[PDB]
Design a protein around this ligand. Structure first.
Ligand SMILES: C=CC[C@@H]1/C=C(\C)C[C@H](C)C[C@H](OC)[C@H]2O[C@@](O)(C(=O)C(=O)N3CCCC[C@H]3C(=O)O[C@H](/C(C)=C/[C@@H]3CC[C@@H](O)[C@H](OC)C3)[C@H](C)[C@@H](O)CC1=O)[C@H](C)C[C@@H]2OC
Length: 128
Protein backbone atom coordinates (compact mmCIF):
# COMPACT_ATOMS: atom_id res chain seq x y z
CA UNK A 1 0.00 0.00 0.00
CA UNK A 2 0.96 3.65 0.13
CA UNK A 3 3.33 3.40 3.14
CA UNK A 4 5.29 0.58 1.49
CA UNK A 5 5.39 2.46 -1.79
CA UNK A 6 6.86 5.65 -0.27
CA UNK A 7 9.32 3.54 1.74
CA UNK A 8 10.54 1.72 -1.36
CA UNK A 9 10.08 4.40 -4.06
CA UNK A 10 10.24 7.76 -2.24
CA UNK A 11 12.71 10.60 -2.71
CA UNK A 12 15.12 11.49 0.11
CA UNK A 13 14.46 15.19 0.72
CA UNK A 14 16.82 15.57 3.68
CA UNK A 15 19.84 17.86 3.35
CA UNK A 16 21.93 15.25 5.16
CA UNK A 17 20.93 12.48 2.68
CA UNK A 18 20.14 10.17 5.53
CA UNK A 19 16.82 8.88 4.12
CA UNK A 20 15.04 10.23 7.25
CA UNK A 21 12.27 11.89 5.24
CA UNK A 22 11.06 10.30 1.98
CA UNK A 23 8.53 11.94 -0.31
CA UNK A 24 6.26 11.10 -3.27
CA UNK A 25 4.29 13.86 -5.01
CA UNK A 26 0.76 12.41 -5.49
CA UNK A 27 -1.10 15.42 -6.92
CA UNK A 28 0.93 18.06 -8.74
CA UNK A 29 0.36 21.61 -7.43
CA UNK A 30 0.39 25.01 -9.07
CA UNK A 31 3.29 26.58 -10.86
CA UNK A 32 6.70 26.64 -9.35
CA UNK A 33 6.56 28.59 -6.07
CA UNK A 34 6.99 26.96 -2.66
CA UNK A 35 6.44 28.72 0.70
CA UNK A 36 9.16 30.64 2.46
CA UNK A 37 10.37 30.47 6.01
CA UNK A 38 7.91 32.18 8.32
CA UNK A 39 4.93 31.88 5.99
CA UNK A 40 1.57 30.92 7.42
CA UNK A 41 0.79 27.55 5.82
CA UNK A 42 -2.58 25.84 5.74
CA UNK A 43 -2.62 22.07 5.28
CA UNK A 44 -4.86 19.10 5.49
CA UNK A 45 -3.30 15.82 6.60
CA UNK A 46 -3.84 12.19 7.53
CA UNK A 47 -1.36 10.16 9.61
CA UNK A 48 -0.80 6.44 9.96
CA UNK A 49 1.43 4.34 12.22
CA UNK A 50 3.56 1.51 10.88
CA UNK A 51 1.06 -0.92 12.43
CA UNK A 52 -1.59 0.32 10.00
CA UNK A 53 -3.53 2.40 12.51
CA UNK A 54 -4.77 5.85 11.37
CA UNK A 55 -3.81 8.15 14.27
CA UNK A 56 -5.15 11.50 13.06
CA UNK A 57 -6.85 13.43 10.31
CA UNK A 58 -7.56 17.14 9.98
CA UNK A 59 -10.25 16.37 7.42
CA UNK A 60 -12.25 14.70 10.18
CA UNK A 61 -12.20 18.05 12.10
CA UNK A 62 -13.44 20.07 9.10
CA UNK A 63 -10.57 22.55 9.59
CA UNK A 64 -6.99 22.69 8.33
CA UNK A 65 -3.89 22.74 10.48
CA UNK A 66 -2.19 26.14 10.37
CA UNK A 67 1.39 26.91 11.39
CA UNK A 68 4.35 29.15 10.59
CA UNK A 69 6.84 27.31 8.39
CA UNK A 70 10.43 26.68 9.40
CA UNK A 71 10.05 27.67 13.04
CA UNK A 72 9.97 24.28 14.78
CA UNK A 73 6.23 24.52 15.39
CA UNK A 74 5.93 20.98 13.96
CA UNK A 75 8.16 17.88 13.80
CA UNK A 76 11.24 18.19 11.67
CA UNK A 77 9.85 16.10 8.81
CA UNK A 78 6.97 18.55 8.38
CA UNK A 79 9.12 21.67 8.30
CA UNK A 80 11.34 19.96 5.73
CA UNK A 81 8.56 18.38 3.73
CA UNK A 82 6.04 21.23 3.58
CA UNK A 83 8.81 23.59 2.48
CA UNK A 84 9.15 21.51 -0.71
CA UNK A 85 5.47 21.68 -1.67
CA UNK A 86 3.64 23.85 -4.19
CA UNK A 87 0.18 25.25 -3.53
CA UNK A 88 -2.44 22.58 -4.21
CA UNK A 89 0.10 19.74 -4.00
CA UNK A 90 -0.66 16.46 -2.25
CA UNK A 91 2.27 14.37 -1.12
CA UNK A 92 3.14 11.31 0.93
CA UNK A 93 5.88 11.62 3.52
CA UNK A 94 7.57 8.82 5.36
CA UNK A 95 9.18 10.09 8.53
CA UNK A 96 11.81 8.17 10.51
CA UNK A 97 11.65 8.83 14.27
CA UNK A 98 14.69 11.15 14.25
CA UNK A 99 12.56 13.54 12.16
CA UNK A 100 9.39 12.92 14.20
CA UNK A 101 8.90 11.98 17.92
CA UNK A 102 12.10 10.00 18.51
CA UNK A 103 12.31 7.74 21.55
CA UNK A 104 9.82 9.87 23.49
CA UNK A 105 6.82 9.35 21.26
CA UNK A 106 3.73 11.46 21.79
CA UNK A 107 1.25 10.44 24.40
CA UNK A 108 -1.17 8.81 23.62
CA UNK A 109 -1.10 8.51 19.79
CA UNK A 110 2.56 7.78 18.94
CA UNK A 111 4.79 5.04 20.44
CA UNK A 112 8.50 5.28 21.02
CA UNK A 113 10.76 4.97 17.97
CA UNK A 114 7.86 5.27 15.49
CA UNK A 115 8.18 5.68 11.73
CA UNK A 116 5.21 7.73 10.54
CA UNK A 117 3.30 8.03 7.28
CA UNK A 118 1.51 11.24 6.34
CA UNK A 119 -0.59 12.33 3.40
CA UNK A 120 -0.35 16.15 3.27
CA UNK A 121 -2.23 18.67 1.11
CA UNK A 122 -0.79 22.20 0.97
CA UNK A 123 -3.93 24.31 0.73
CA UNK A 124 -2.37 27.77 0.88
CA UNK A 125 0.58 29.79 2.08
CA UNK A 126 0.68 33.48 3.07
CA UNK A 127 3.38 35.92 4.14
CA UNK A 128 2.23 37.73 7.30
C1 LIG B 1 0.40 20.88 23.69
C2 LIG B 1 -0.88 21.26 23.32
C3 LIG B 1 -1.58 20.53 22.39
C4 LIG B 1 -1.29 21.00 20.97
C5 LIG B 1 -2.34 20.35 20.07
C6 LIG B 1 -2.88 21.04 18.99
C7 LIG B 1 -2.55 22.51 18.71
C8 LIG B 1 -3.84 20.30 18.06
C9 LIG B 1 -3.09 19.80 16.83
C10 LIG B 1 -4.03 19.61 15.63
C11 LIG B 1 -2.23 18.60 17.09
C12 LIG B 1 -2.99 17.26 17.04
O1 LIG B 1 -4.04 17.26 17.99
C13 LIG B 1 -5.22 16.68 17.45
C14 LIG B 1 -2.16 16.02 17.20
O2 LIG B 1 -1.46 15.87 15.96
C15 LIG B 1 -0.84 14.59 15.79
O3 LIG B 1 -1.82 13.57 15.84
C16 LIG B 1 -0.26 14.68 14.39
O4 LIG B 1 -0.80 14.21 13.41
C17 LIG B 1 1.11 15.32 14.24
O5 LIG B 1 2.07 14.51 14.26
N1 LIG B 1 1.27 16.63 14.05
C18 LIG B 1 0.14 17.54 13.89
C19 LIG B 1 0.19 18.31 12.61
C20 LIG B 1 1.55 18.99 12.45
C21 LIG B 1 2.66 17.91 12.52
C22 LIG B 1 2.63 17.17 13.85
C23 LIG B 1 3.14 18.05 14.96
O6 LIG B 1 4.28 18.48 14.84
O7 LIG B 1 2.34 18.28 15.98
C24 LIG B 1 2.80 19.13 17.06
C25 LIG B 1 3.50 18.30 18.13
C26 LIG B 1 2.75 17.17 18.78
C27 LIG B 1 4.76 18.65 18.48
C28 LIG B 1 5.60 18.03 19.60
C29 LIG B 1 5.66 19.02 20.78
C30 LIG B 1 6.65 18.55 21.84
C31 LIG B 1 8.07 18.34 21.28
O8 LIG B 1 8.87 17.75 22.38
C32 LIG B 1 7.99 17.28 20.17
O9 LIG B 1 9.34 17.27 19.60
C33 LIG B 1 9.59 16.15 18.77
C34 LIG B 1 7.01 17.75 19.09
C35 LIG B 1 1.59 19.91 17.60
C36 LIG B 1 0.87 20.69 16.51
C37 LIG B 1 2.01 20.73 18.79
O10 LIG B 1 2.95 21.72 18.42
C38 LIG B 1 0.87 21.41 19.52
C39 LIG B 1 0.05 20.52 20.44
O11 LIG B 1 0.49 19.39 20.77
C40 LIG B 1 0.21 14.39 16.89
C41 LIG B 1 0.81 13.02 16.80
C42 LIG B 1 -0.44 14.62 18.28
C43 LIG B 1 -1.14 15.98 18.33
O12 LIG B 1 -1.80 16.14 19.58
C44 LIG B 1 -0.97 16.42 20.68
Amino acid sequence: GAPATVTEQGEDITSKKDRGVLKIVKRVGNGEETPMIGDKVYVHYKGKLSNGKKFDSSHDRNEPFVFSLGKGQVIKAWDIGVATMKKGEICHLLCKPEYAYGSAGSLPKIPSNATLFFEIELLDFKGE
